[PDB]
């Protein structure tokens, strides 16, 4: 049953109001960049324009609740998922060596208050290690996620 239910929309609606600090039911570039800044980032207006402009259907330069709702289900269509999958490697790969090492993966997890045991991280690398290079590359990372 892939039919969307009214109760499920309420579950993401509560989270939706947290990003829109204005309370006007719309997200403005100032509201997103201001909270995005907390993530220790410093993006430019032109960079955010392309991201928001792509999902802007009313051309109002803001994301309205229904525009947001479409993105949430868009995960099933996997339309932008390709962009997030390629972008996520950039955030997970802190060294930028093009390969993610074991020490690097624990760091991003720690900043989010998350932490597992070495055996858990050791086994995870063993299962994802397809080429056997000892490190995870873009090939293994994209291939690991394209599983049925």
């Amino acid at each position: 049953a892939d039919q969307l239910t009214e109760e499920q929309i309420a579950e993401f609606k509560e989270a939706f109001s947290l990003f829109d600090k204005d309370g006007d039911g719309t997200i403005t570039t100032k509201e997103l960049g201001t909270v995005m800044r907390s993530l220790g980032q410093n993006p430019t207006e032109a960079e955010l324009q392309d991201m928001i402009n792509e999902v802007d259907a009313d051309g109002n330069g803001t994301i309205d609740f229904p525009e947001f709702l479409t993105m949430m289900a868009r995960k099933m269509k996997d339309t932008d998922s390709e962009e997030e999958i390629r972008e996520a490697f950039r955030v997970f790969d802190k060294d930028g060596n093009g390969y993610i090492s074991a020490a690097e993966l624990r760091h991003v997890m720690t900043n989010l208050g998350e932490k597992l045991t070495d055996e858990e991280v050791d086994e995870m690398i063993r299962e994802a290690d397809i080429d056997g290079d000892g490190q995870v590359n873009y090939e293994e990372f994209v291939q690991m996620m394209t599983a049925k």
Partner: peptide
């Protein structure tokens, strides 16, 4: 970011498949 918010779902349900 519009796409950044999309990632939350990938690390939520997608990370669950691990166990």
């Amino acid at each position: 970011m519009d796409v950044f918010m999309k990632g939350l779902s990938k690390a939520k349900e997608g990370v669950v498949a691990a166990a």
